[PDB]
Amino acid sequence: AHHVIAMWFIRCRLPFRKDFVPFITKGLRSNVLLSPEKDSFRARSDENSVAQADDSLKNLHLELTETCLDMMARYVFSNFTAVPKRSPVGEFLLAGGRTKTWLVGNKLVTVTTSVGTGTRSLLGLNLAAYVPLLTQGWAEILVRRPTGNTSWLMSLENPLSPFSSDINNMPLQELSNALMAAEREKVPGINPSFVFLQLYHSPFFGDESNKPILLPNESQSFERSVQ
Amino acid sequence: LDMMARYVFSNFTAVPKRSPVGEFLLAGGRTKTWLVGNKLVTVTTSVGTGTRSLLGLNLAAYVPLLTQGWAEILVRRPTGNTSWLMSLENPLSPFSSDINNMPLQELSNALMAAERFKEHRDTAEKVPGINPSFVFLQLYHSPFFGDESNKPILLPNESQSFERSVQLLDQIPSYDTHKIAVLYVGEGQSNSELAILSNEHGSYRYTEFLTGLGRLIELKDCQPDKVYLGGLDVCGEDGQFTYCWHDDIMQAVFHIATLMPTKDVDKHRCDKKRHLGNDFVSIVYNDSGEDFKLGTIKGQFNFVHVIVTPLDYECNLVSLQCRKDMEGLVDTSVAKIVSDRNLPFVARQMALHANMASQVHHSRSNPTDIYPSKWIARLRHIKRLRQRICEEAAYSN
Amino acid sequence: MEFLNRQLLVLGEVNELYLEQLQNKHSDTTKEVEMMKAAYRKELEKNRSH
Amino acid sequence: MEFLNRQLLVLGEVNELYLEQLQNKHSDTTKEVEMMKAAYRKELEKNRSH
Amino acid sequence: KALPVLVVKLTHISATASMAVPLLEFLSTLARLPHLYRNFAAEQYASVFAISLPYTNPSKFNQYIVCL
């Protein structure tokens, strides 16, 4: 039944698609009500075995409901593929980049910021201490969700602070001359938590369960779990 | 907390500079704005905007396919705006896009699929462009929200009275704005309001004190929204130049009487008094050898004066005179003696702290006004906008 | 690639223009230097007249 | 073609950094102004003493 | 050279209204003199915030003090 719903929601004409979110959500909600439930996002746009059977049934109710809603949210407004592919310029910027992942509810937001690895290879590499500053505005945010991965290569549009950061001393004459002539928090690059906080930070929450959970970046286990 | 979340890992300015190519690609784009807590998450997506001319390029298909992943997410917050031009890595689905024609030329131009770059030259139900709610839902959607503290609220896109509200938020700066008067008092001018405003050039020590107040800004070439002019005319009614003092947290501008022209038409120098008399604080360069008295410039406001009395041997005596109601916030007993080389720092910063005290006092006597702390002014605007939406939605049900 | 070469020569010209301008950013001080000269002249004239 | 694209991207970032330096960096060659300040102040001390 | 020890010594001052304006004026003038704290370690900055945080309390301190 969920395969039928997903098939039709993804293939039915895009203008009608939003108006089916409330009907599907109300139907799913009514099913759960027989055993904060609503989440109609269009507003934003021995007998022990029996006990375990019931508990797993209620959990399965929610897993089906949550995956249906995630599919709906993913496809109500676009028909982009559930898998992203980083463009060659995206790899040029973010290969060897500085990355962090957060579990934000039942999704994995990941942010990767550009250390000047590709820039160094371009210049053939004092300039080496400034080539990460040259591309630190570029990043990628990648949301892993029950129904797929979405990602955008993003370039920060804000100029670096002329007061509280090093721009006025960047060797732009050498940097420009170098990359034109070439042919073919000490860590470089901004912390990905900058992008994450600028997008997702809220000074207050209804319950502690709402909070993002940072995946421990030094552990092999959680990295392998994302992989 | 918003400042900490903004500056902990970065030192990026509080105002985005949308690229020329970003403006080109996102002009007339499909835009929607959400309150997500006390933030306005705005997403805009591209409608194409004749990208064929930018790239100099099945002819009717590959350009719209290429553009419709381009977007901007702009988060207006109490402490400023952050934005990123965005470009989806997700290609259009061959199984679920329009069934008329699906060529693979998109993948053939994958390197150009993010051809928005920081600098460029851009020129010599059927509505196009992906819904900004795709970017929003993919970033922010999840079940089991905090029912009213966290649940996103879409600003009514149809009613212009809310786009006006967001435009007001963009006109509330992301930095405290201070306007500081600077007056020169010559010999015998200690009691003449007219003579003080009529000065066109001061002593040499006064001019060197001016040169230290900050950067000289040629007003003609300054954007009022970005460089705080405090009220000075861009077109030169108030002089070619003025001094301004910038910081991430605040922008102070100096209204310097001597830099403002004296026209024969202006009898009482009202072209100057309209600025100097409406400022909370004036640095009075008291070269008159006689105690300058607060209220000599008769106008309202002028709560605190930073009186700079030049002494002999390249030094100055800086003191504060303030109105009897301001005296609880500003300490008039200050007699900071400072050398000439550091006078335009000490008097400048005394003027800042006097102006902050004055702006707070003005709020106490004028509560309805926009808050002096522009971060709190933005936050109260965001709070008021959120509450207004709740009221109007309630009145709509 | 013809488009890329065209944008590259355009941005090379633009970069050279920015480079030339920053070779002579010093001229921005003359605006206040003139104020200093005027004040010094006025002081000298007033004292000499006195 | 890919090298040209990478070079154009990095050159664009260089140009944006040039633009933000140009609109934010102070004027250079301040020694002349320093010497003028010192000379004016010294002669002002002399004339004021007189 | 006195600053690294100085900022610590200011933390020992009790947060009182008579001291709020001088301490915050000192820290705000110091902040605008970047050549002085260029060699500040984490303990020095922690001293700076330890001095100024008590004064962020409108339940005790005047609104000007809190804004400053």
From Swiss-Prot, chain B:
It is found in: Lysosome membrane; Cytoplasm, Cytosol. Changing residue 229 to A: Decreased GTPase-activating protein activity. GO terms for cellular component: cytoplasm; cytosol; Golgi apparatus; lysosomal membrane; lysosome; membrane; nucleus; perinuclear region of cytoplasm. GO terms for molecular function: GTPase activator activity; Hsp90 protein binding; phosphatase binding; protein homodimerization activity; small GTPase binding. Phosphorylation by AMPK activates it and leads to negative regulation of the mTORC1 complex. Ubiquitinated by the DCX(FBXW5) E3 ubiquitin-protein ligase complex, leading to its subsequent degradation. Ubiquitinated by MYCBP2 independently of its phosphorylation status leading to subsequent degradation; association with TSC1 protects from ubiquitination. One of its GO terms (biological process) is regulation of cell cycle. Keywords: Cytoplasm, Disease variant, Epilepsy, GTPase activation, Host-virus interaction, Lysosome, Membrane, Phosphoprotein, Tumor suppressor, Ubl conjugation. Residues 166-393 form the Rap-GAP domain. Liver, brain, heart, lymphocytes, fibroblasts, biliary epithelium, pancreas, skeletal muscle, kidney, lung and placenta. Changing residue 316 to K: In TSC2; Abolishes GAP activity. Changing residue 229 to M: In TSC2; uncertain significance. Its main location: membrane. It is linked to Tuberous sclerosis 2: An autosomal dominant multi-system disorder that affects especially the brain, kidneys, heart, and skin. It is characterized by hamartomas (benign overgrowths predominantly of a cell or tissue type that occurs normally in the organ) and hamartias (developmental abnormalities of tissue combination). Clinical manifestations include epilepsy, learning difficulties, behavioral problems, and skin lesions. Seizures can be intractable and premature death can occur from a variety of disease-associated causes. Catalytic component of the TSC-TBC complex, a multiprotein complex that acts as a negative regulator of the canonical mTORC1 complex, an evolutionarily conserved central nutrient sensor that stimulates anabolic reactions and macromolecule biosynthesis to promote cellular biomass generation and growth. Within the TSC-TBC complex, TSC2 acts as a GTPase-activating protein (GAP) for the small GTPase RHEB, a direct activator of the protein kinase activity of mTORC1. This is Tuberin. The chain holds residues 1027 to 1762 of 1807 of the full protein.
Curated annotation (Swiss-Prot), chains C, D:
It is found in: Lysosome membrane; Cytoplasm, Cytosol. It comes from the Eukaryota. Highly expressed in skeletal muscle, followed by heart, brain, placenta, pancreas, lung, liver and kidney. Also expressed in embryonic kidney cells. Changing residue 39 to T: In TSC1; uncertain significance; no effect on expression; no effect on subcellular localization; no effect on inhibition of TORC1 signaling. Signal peptide: none annotated. The C-terminal putative coiled-coil domain is necessary for interaction with TSC2. Component of the TSC-TBC complex (also named Rhebulator complex), composed of 2 molecules of TSC1, 2 molecules of TSC2 and 1 molecule of TBC1D7. Probably forms a complex composed of chaperones HSP90 and HSP70, co-chaperones STIP1/HOP, CDC37, PPP5C, PTGES3/p23, TSC1 and client protein TSC2. Forms a complex composed of chaperones HSP90 and HSP70, co-chaperones CDC37, PPP5C, TSC1 and client protein TSC2, CDK4, AKT, RAF1 and NR3C1; this complex does not contain co-chaperones STIP1/HOP and PTGES3/p23. Non-catalytic component of the TSC-TBC complex, a multiprotein complex that acts as a negative regulator of the canonical mTORC1 complex, an evolutionarily conserved central nutrient sensor that stimulates anabolic reactions and macromolecule biosynthesis to promote cellular biomass generation and growth. The TSC-TBC complex acts as a GTPase-activating protein (GAP) for the small GTPase RHEB, a direct activator of the protein kinase activity of mTORC1. It is linked to Tuberous sclerosis 1: An autosomal dominant multi-system disorder that affects especially the brain, kidneys, heart, and skin. It is characterized by hamartomas (benign overgrowths predominantly of a cell or tissue type that occurs normally in the organ) and hamartias (developmental abnormalities of tissue combination). Clinical manifestations include epilepsy, learning difficulties, behavioral problems, and skin lesions. Seizures can be intractable and premature death can occur from a variety of disease-associated causes. This is Hamartin. It comes from Homo sapiens. The chain holds residues 845 to 894 of 1164 of the full protein.
